Copies of this chain bind each other. A is one copy, B any other.
Amino acid sequence: QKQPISKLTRATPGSAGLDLCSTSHTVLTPEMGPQALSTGIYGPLPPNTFGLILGRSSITMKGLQVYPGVIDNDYTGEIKIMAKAVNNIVTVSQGNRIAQLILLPLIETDNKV
């Protein structure tokens, strides 16, 4: 876009996740293995939070696996969805909502950096 994370929207007031759509039309087959789908949405995240990319249930049930992804607080690049056709040929259309971004507290530890 570059579009910030503040332009994502959430389905309902109770929704845990911010919806992420692909900006591309993409056809995916099982033998293709993981593919990085474009979102046009960019990091970074609110202070003291990090992000988790997870699939939507309807999409997962339709045979498209989204691999859990961690977005770091200070990531400033494009948020991509890591996706794979499980059994069937899977077609993603431009603007389909394919994943969700969940925001979570970033816990501070003394681990060396």
Interface residues of A (CB under 8 A from B): 6, 8-18, 30-31, 33-34, 36, 44, 46, 49-51, 54-55, 57, 60-61, 63, 65, 67-75, 82, 84, 86-88, 100, 102-107, 109-113
Could you list 9 examples of A-B contacts with CB < 8 Å?
Answer: A9-B111, A13-B74, A13-B113, A30-B87, A33-B86, A33-B87, A55-B67, A55-B68, A84-B86
| Copies of this chain, whole number | 3
Q: How many whole Å from A28's CB to the nearest CB in chain B?
A: 12
Are the C-beta atoms of A104 and B107 separated by less than 8 Å?
yes
Are the C-beta atoms of B70 and A17 separated by less than 8 Å?
yes
Are the C-beta atoms of A104 and B103 separated by less than 8 Å?
no
A71–B54 CA distance with the chains assembled, in angstroms: 12
